[PDB]
Design a protein around this ligand. Sequence first.
Ligand SMILES: Nc1nc2c(ncn2[C@@H]2O[C@H](COP(=O)(O)OP(=O)(O)O)[C@@H](O)[C@H]2O)c(=O)[nH]1
Ligand SMILES: CC(C)(C)c1[nH]cnc1/C=c1\[nH]c(=O)/c(=C/c2ccccc2)[nH]c1=O
Ligand SMILES: [Ca+2]
Ligand SMILES: [Mg+2]
Lengths: 424, 57
Amino acid sequence: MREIVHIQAGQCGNQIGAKFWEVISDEHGIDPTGSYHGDSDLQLERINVYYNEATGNKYVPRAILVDLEPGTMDSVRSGPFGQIFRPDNFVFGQSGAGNNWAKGHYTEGAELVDSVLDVVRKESESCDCLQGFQLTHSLGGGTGSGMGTLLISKIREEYPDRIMNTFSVMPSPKVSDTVVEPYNATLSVHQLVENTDETYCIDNEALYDICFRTLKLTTPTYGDLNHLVSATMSGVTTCLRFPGQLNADLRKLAVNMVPFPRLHFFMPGFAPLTSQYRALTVPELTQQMFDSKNMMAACDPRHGRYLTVAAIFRGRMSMKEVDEQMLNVQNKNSSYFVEWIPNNVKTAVCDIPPRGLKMSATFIGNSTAIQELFKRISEQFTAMFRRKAFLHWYTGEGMDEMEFTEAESNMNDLVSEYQQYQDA
Amino acid sequence: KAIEENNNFIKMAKEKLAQKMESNKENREAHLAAMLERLQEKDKHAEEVRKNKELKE
Ligand SMILES: Nc1nc2c(ncn2[C@@H]2O[C@H](COP(=O)(O)OP(=O)(O)O)[C@@H](O)[C@H]2O)c(=O)[nH]1
Ligand SMILES: CC(C)(C)c1[nH]cnc1/C=c1\[nH]c(=O)/c(=C/c2ccccc2)[nH]c1=O
Ligand SMILES: [Ca+2]
Ligand SMILES: [Mg+2]
């Protein structure tokens, strides 16, 4: 188990996805045309996880770029690292999906899905040992939401034993393109509860607040939100992309993070938050990454309890001080970690720091406080659905009101299930 | 179901339209048929007037 297949779907999926390849290619010393110009052998030791090797010693990302319109995928190709991607892996339709889950999942996206799966099969075939898939998308649009979850369902049919993880951007009125986002997200969440092993719940509410409150940016663009996303995505993928004596693949990580199959929605976090000169001390990283302000999903961890925690520190620091600090927050806030999973906070350290920072920490939290996120989308859903508002857009594409009722019920069951373990 | 309903709408729009355009052509023709039949009734009255002049001499 070494190779991971990456897929990016829709405007948002391709935007944050393109930043992921901008960040990690710099970390692996791969230039905009695909040639290696690093210095450490550690940059090439596990380069196979995300790159295929081409003729002339070129490194081509194992990345499939999906959208139902050309727009954003034309921007990706024109953008700074656009030339590195394999041209066959740009699979796109023309009419778009108009922020419509039904168009992505059932009509427009159905017409395109089989040609995307052919490229996935192409990449999966020439993989010595495929460990799984990762997907970037939003749940608020049409393509990433509707087609992304369709692809996830088709990939599970063809590759039932491989890991499926997602980086799933959640919608919020604060950063809102259309009023139907709660509908699109609720329909997607039900798909993710069934068909993913992990979903990283990037909340655009939280990314905005981090940009506004704790980074003093008055008018945040999507680039400012995506900067925080790409830093986190680098962090969660670090332990696969480098050593250091950590013998773990996606399954091993998923086995230790997910005690219950449906409860695999994580709370990502990063320290320090950037947009510096004084490098942070190990106590500061530990306090910041556990701080609510640094959470990428707009939930208060004090309102829930941690099932599992994973923290991966980057940079040259004392592992003794890391162990001391990670044991300090557990033993001084022991009510917020479930007693019925002993030793649930685990830690790794990687020597290579990311670009610009001398040391950093990435936080992955399977907290029951994530119910707050699903409750917030459930309220926005019901507000519209009690009056069947905007439903004509979905019923015109052949959907039934029953499918909405089901999805509503399934997400409120997920919230009930998170509540069960919060009190136990 | 999405095809079925899009076809249903094309179907029933086409039938509703053909039913109206035919019903209108029936009406407008029956309106003009009545107008000419009243005008032809005057020609028959003017033939009785011109006969009652000659049949009174
Ligand atoms: N964080 C982030 N969110 C985005 C971005 N672009 C769109 N969104 C969010 O995604 C939703 C719209 O989906 P989008 O990806 O544009 O539609 P799609 O192309 O049909 O998948 C909204 O909730 C937006 O707030 C982006 O670049 N970054
Ligand atoms: C011991 C340590 C810190 C390595 C650990 N223990 C359990 N989890 C992790 C970390 C991770 N756990 C994950 O599940 C994880 C998920 C992942 C990795 C790559 C791509 C997508 C998801 N990434 C991680 O870094
Ligand atoms: Ca078509
Ligand atoms: Mg959009």
